[PDB]
Write a protein that binds this DNA or RNA. Structure first.
Lengths: 94, 36, 134, 129, 129, 58, 125, 44, 225, 92
RNA sequence: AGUUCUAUUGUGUUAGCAUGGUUUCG
RNA sequence: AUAAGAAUUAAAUCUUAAAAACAAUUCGUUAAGCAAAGAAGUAGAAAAUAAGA
RNA sequence: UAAUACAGGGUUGAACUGUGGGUUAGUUUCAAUGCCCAAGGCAGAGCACUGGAUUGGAUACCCAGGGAACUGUGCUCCCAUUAAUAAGAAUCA
């Protein structure tokens, strides 16, 4: 208590918590048509739901992204086996 | 190899086959030896 | 003032019954034979009594020498005195064999004739039925 | 062809979220077909390797079987009316390579083109060679 | 003090992480509330003598198999008549008996136990870390 | 650059010790590392001890 | 012939995991069991898919094995702390300390800074 | 073969650098406590 | 180290076990076979003890194992019918059977209870078998319905020993014939040497249990502290 | 070489026992028996394989028996797995 | 993988030498 | 013949013998041909060979 | 398996190079002991054989002696023939 550390002691770092840290972006790496993660909009194939990720390099939205997102959303909306849809971005700051 | 090794084991080849390995009872080879 | 702020629980300060090194599992019968050799080499002193042999030797020496025993039987007398002083309050050991103690640690390897017992269920099962409604 | 016959092993893994396989453009195209058919969650191209993120359902994997047809030591080709008979009464996916790309046996049957039979996915017990 | 192998790889536990535990609580709360909203329903609680004396060692569910020919028979076979929820604290010990049990099972166990015996997820229906 | 690794096939074969009472190596020696072997770092996790020589030149 | 030589084949079993709700729905539909009272509650609160979450556990390399060695080699006196507490094995060949040991705190802070994006030496300083 | 072009993670990282922080999982202490309190209230 | 001039390559499991450091089975390769699990079905092996099959869900004096020599079989097969037209004027002629288990404390290793039960059965003309020991008793009784009811009442209320629990099971009525012809007792006839060997084995098991019990009790004391 | 022992303020039997221990730990009798008669190379291969497989097991079981004897002598109790997150704080 | 150099060689062929069982000589 | 040495389950063949140069034991000196006793964990990468009885 | 001489292979690094490979007969370098041939020829030990025992009996096991074989860029590859159950790619952190 005088010099040693304790879990209750404020500032006690958990080594396992620090070690098991993960990069948030790496959660969508397996999402593409050709697998190069270059498409504007990336759709993941999941059971019972849809997942769409915006993957523009700068986070900007253009006609290519518009068309891709439109087609993906229409297909998912019409699909009854997909009970819900999720929309996210693969960028860092946007 | 099944029937072939069976013949080897029962010794028909030991009698009827020439051997560049020679031996005092086996048939010998009078020609230069090569792998066949 | 300054001093240790945690319990001195180190297993060196408080030795515990454990094997600090693991080893690839050994065939049960081979391990049993090795342990038997070790026990024979140690000569586990489970004899009638440690003092019985000393007393027998002393009595035999006295019988052999009925006249000059006073001077002849002195090494035997000292040995018997030492044995009485050391193992006078001697009790035969009551402990499990090292073979069973190591089967507990699972050191050996299951062979055709040796299998570890399955986990107990009848003795360990504790059930508590309570109402859960409303 | 060798790379595809190798990727069969990486696709047939169980109790795994993702598995790696050798890279090749043919592998990429077959993976595109599989994802369009909804048999894998996805895949990623990393240099010499491709990381396939597999899909599961109720514990078991979606891909329950892979039967290789065309090996690098033997091609297998079919006319449309032979492909129809060979794929009769089966919900499995028979991958076909044609002059129009790597497609499914159903696309090949509608197009009436001659194709090379590569793989059969979830085809149960249906093969001839 | 140690003379054994020193591992180099540590495995994470997603099943027993903070958010997964929160979701476990949220999902189990609804089932427990719905069960308690119905009357005359009893919940059995199973544990180990070393983790609970006062608790009775025999109940209605216990079958107490005594013959060798009955070794394969489960001991909790009849629990379904009396109970509508089995709260287990020793899934590793009771796995063979909770397998395909006809009542919902809420298991409490540690990440180490889950990882060392992942088959307990086939006998547990609800998990509370 | 993306280049595949080279084959792990090597000429000569594998170490063989001559049969009989000679003890001679028909090929290669006892320190030979097969191509299908883990890394040196994997096989020697501890690394050099504190009393080993930093420079191995004689 | 052989037995369990069919890797990627019949060695593994690709069978679905049927939880309580699935099994009970099947039993009720086929009429082998009378509808239990708890079944409605179980259906309205279906069990989660535990196998999918299990597949998410990933093995991680232990950078502490080397970070602890570095810090100990720089400051050997850290082994005195909590030397009498069970959990700190300071014998040669182990150097495995408790999470509350100064060595563990040091390496944890260093790895946290590295994750934040510093070099090993900068994090050490 | 060393002059071929194939997408690579090194290439992606180089592009981003021309233009990765790991994060620790949150603990949700308050939410866990509230859920535990609700479960205890149910079991009262 | 020594120089053997080569190594050996035995193929059999016996010689490999002799000539290798260990032949312990290793964990299955995740790329080849699945991991072993507690749910795996057990091997289909008949339980045997010293070569005899132990296949019986209940102990009974009429349990026998099939031997290698012919035993005379009944020349024909005829099952007497069950008389179901029984009224108050005839319900007393029906036969019956039951099994009983008693738990508690008895003295003289159950000799007193054995004698009492034998006397009661001799008076009531019951048949079957009984088995009494220091802490338990079991039996299978057959006879007239009234006699069975009297025996049940005697066992429940008229036993001169500590009877903590009584249980009756496998009750049947309306039987045409009786299996047994006398009420005998199952007496432990093991030799004293056999008893001593069994006691030594039991003591070994007890010591094994006591070690872990002491460890657990110390752990519980530390937790309490 | 030849072991030399000085019998000074000790028993000749004790010194002879020490010499016997030296011989056993140096395998002198083993080598003498080996050289007294001809051993074919294959027999030597088998013997060396057997010894290399056997002796480590003996050493491990010797260590185990030493631990057992120490624990019995000192009345030590079986260990329980160290539960993590224990504060390990003094009750003072 | 291959070629060159680099540090290391219980690998294979090598003139001789130190030591040693055995036999030998007194 | 015989004893001793040697050997053997026990014996015998064999060597020496009467004061000893080489039967056997002890001590020196060369000589001859011959040459893995001593120094390396088939162990520790997760690294794993064959459905069952 | 000390030093020295002549050659490999393995490991590590730098450079070079740029699909240059995996498998392999109408292919041939090497390869225990024995046998044939040649060498030497009595350090040791040792087939056949001799004689000293055991055995109804042994042509053996035991003892004493022993001219076959025990070192070769030759003839040469029969085998329970040499680091294993052929070599290569893929799946794993």
């Amino acid at each position: 208590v005088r010099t040693g550390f304790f879990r209750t002691d404020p500032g006690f770092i958990d080594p396992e918590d620090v070690l098991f840290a993960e990069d948030p972006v790496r959660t969508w790496s397996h999402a593409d048509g050709g697998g190069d993660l270059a498409e504007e909009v990336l759709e993941r194939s999941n059971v019972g739901m849809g997942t769409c990720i915006l993957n523009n390099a700068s986070g900007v939205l253009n006609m290519k992204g518009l068309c891709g997102l439109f087609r993906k959303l229409r297909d998912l909306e019409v699909n009854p086996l997909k009970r819900f849809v999720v929309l996210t971005s693969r960028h860092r700051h946007f | 190899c099944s029937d072939r090794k069976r013949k080897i084991l029962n010794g028909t080849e030991y009698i009827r086959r020439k051997s560049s390995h020679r031996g005092r009872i086996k048939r010998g080879s009078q020609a230069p030896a090569f792998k066949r | 003032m300054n001093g240790c702020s945690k319990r001195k629980s180190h297993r060196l300060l408080k030795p515990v019954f454990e094997l600090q090194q693991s080893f690839p599992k050994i065939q049960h019968w081979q391990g049993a034979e090795i342990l038997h050799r070790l026990k024979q080499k140690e000569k586990d002193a489970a004899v009638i009594h440690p003092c019985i042999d000393t007393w027998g030797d002393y009595a035999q020496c006295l019988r052999r020498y009925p006249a000059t025993s006073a001077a002849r039987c002195r090494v035997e007398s000292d040995r018997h005195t030492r044995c009485l002083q050391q193992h006078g309050r001697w009790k035969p050991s009551d402990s499990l064999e090292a073979l069973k103690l190591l089967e507990m640690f699972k050191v050996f390897n299951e062979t055709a004739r040796f299998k570890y017992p399955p986990p107990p269920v009848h003795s360990l099962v504790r059930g508590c039925a309570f109402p859960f409604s409303d | 062809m060798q790379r595809a016959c190798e990727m069969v092993v990486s696709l047939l893994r169980v109790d795994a979220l993702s598995q790696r396989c050798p890279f090749h453009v043919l592998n990429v195209q077959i993976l595109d077909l599989l994802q369009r058919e909804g048999l894998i969650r996805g895949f990623k191209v990393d240099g010499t390797k491709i990381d396939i993120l597999l899909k599961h359902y109720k514990g078991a994997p979606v891909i329950r079987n892979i039967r290789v047809v065309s090996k690098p030591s033997r091609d297998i080709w079919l006319t449309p009316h032979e492909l129809k008979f060979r794929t009769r009464f089966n919900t499995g996916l028979w991958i076909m390579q044609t002059s129009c790309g790597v497609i499914s046996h159903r696309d090949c049957l509608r197009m009436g083109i001659g194709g090379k039979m590569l793989m059969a996915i979830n085809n149960g017990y249906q093969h001839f060679c | 003090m140690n003379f054994n192998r020193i591992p180099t790889r540590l495995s994470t536990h997603y099943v027993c992480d903070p958010y997964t535990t929160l979701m476990h609580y949220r999902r189990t709360f609804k089932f427990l509330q719905a069960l308690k909203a119905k009357p005359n329903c009893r919940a059995l609680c199973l544990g180990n003598k070393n983790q609970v004396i006062s608790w009775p060692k025999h109940f209605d569910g216990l079958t107490v198999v005594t013959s060798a020919v009955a070794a394969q028979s489960s001991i909790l076979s009849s629990a379904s008549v009396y109970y509508s929820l089995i709260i287990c604290l020793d899934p590793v010990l009771f796995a063979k008996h909770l397998y395909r049990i006809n009542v919902p099972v809420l298991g409490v166990c540690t990440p180490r136990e889950i990882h060392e015996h992942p088959e307990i997820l086939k006998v547990i229906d609800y998990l509370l870390p | 650059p993306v280049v595949f690794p080279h084959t792990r096939a090597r000429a000569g074969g594998k170490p063989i010790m001559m049969r009989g009472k000679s003890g001679k190596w028909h090929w290669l020696g006892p320190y030979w590392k097969p191509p299908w072997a883990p890394s040196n770092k994997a096989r020697w996790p501890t690394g050099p001890e504190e009393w080993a020589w930093s420079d191995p030149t004689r | 012939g052989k037995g369990a030589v069919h890797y990627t084949g019949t060695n593994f079993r690709r069978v679905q995991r049927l939880d309580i709700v699935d099994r009970m729905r099947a039993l009720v539909a086929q009429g082998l069991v009378d509808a239990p009272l708890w079944l409605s509650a179980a259906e309205r609160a279906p069990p989660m898919e535990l196998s999918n979450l299990k597949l998410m556990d990933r093995k991680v390399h232990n950078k502490y094995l080397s970070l602890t060695q570095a810090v100990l080699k720089k400051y050997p006196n850290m082994r005195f702390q909590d030397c009498y507490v069970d959990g700190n094995d300071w014998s040669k060949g182990n150097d495995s300390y408790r999470a509350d040991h100064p060595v563990m705190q040091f390496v944890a802070l260093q790895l946290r800074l590295m994750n934040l994006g510093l070099d090993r030496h900068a994090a050490f300083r | 073969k060393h002059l071929d072009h194939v997408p690579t993670e090194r290439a992606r990282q180089l592009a981003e650098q021309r233009s990765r922080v790991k994060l620790e999982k949150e603990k949700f202490l308050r939410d866990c406590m509230r859920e535990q309190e609700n479960l205890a209230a149910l079991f009262t | 180290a020594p120089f053997p001039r080569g190594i050996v390559k035995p193929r059999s499991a016996k010689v490999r076990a002799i000539l290798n450091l260990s032949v312990e089975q290793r964990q299955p390769n995740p790329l080849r076979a699945p991991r072993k699990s507690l749910l795996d079905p057990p091997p289909c092996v008949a339980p045997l003890e010293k070569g005899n099959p132990k296949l019986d869900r209940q102990f009974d004096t009429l349990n026998r194992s099939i031997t290698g020599f012919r035993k005379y079989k009944a020349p024909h097969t005829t099952a007497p019918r069950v008389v179901r037209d029984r009224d108050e004027t005839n319900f007393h002629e029906m036969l019956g059977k039951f099994r009983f288990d008693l738990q508690g404390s008895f003295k003289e290793n159950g000799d007193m209870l054995r004698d009492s039960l034998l006397q009661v059965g001799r008076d009531l003309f019951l048949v079957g078998w009984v088995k009494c020991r220091s802490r338990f008793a079991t039996g299978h009784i057959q006879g007239d319905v009234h006699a069975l009811s009297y025996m049940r009442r005697y066992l429940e209320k008229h036993v001169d020993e500590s009877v903590s629990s009584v249980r009756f099971y496998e009750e049947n009525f309306g039987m045409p014939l009786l299996e047994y012809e006398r009420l005998s007792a199952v007496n432990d006839f093991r030799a004293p040497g056999k008893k001593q060997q069994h006691a030594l084995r039991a003591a070994e098991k007890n010591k094994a249990k006591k070690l872990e019990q002491e460890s657990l009790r110390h752990a519980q004391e530390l937790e309490r502290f | 070489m030849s072991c030399h022992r000085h019998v000074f303020r000790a028993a000749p039997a004790a010194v002879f026992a020490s010499v016997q221990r030296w011989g056993r730990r140096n395998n002198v009798h083993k080598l003498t028996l080996l050289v007294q008669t001809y051993e074919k190379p294959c027999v030597k291969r088998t013997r060396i394989a057997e010894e290399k497989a056997y002796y480590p097991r003996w050493f491990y079981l010797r260590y185990a028996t030493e631990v057992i004897r120490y624990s019995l002598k000192h009345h030590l109790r079986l260990g329980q797995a160290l539960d993590p997150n224990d504060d390990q704080r003094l009750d003072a």
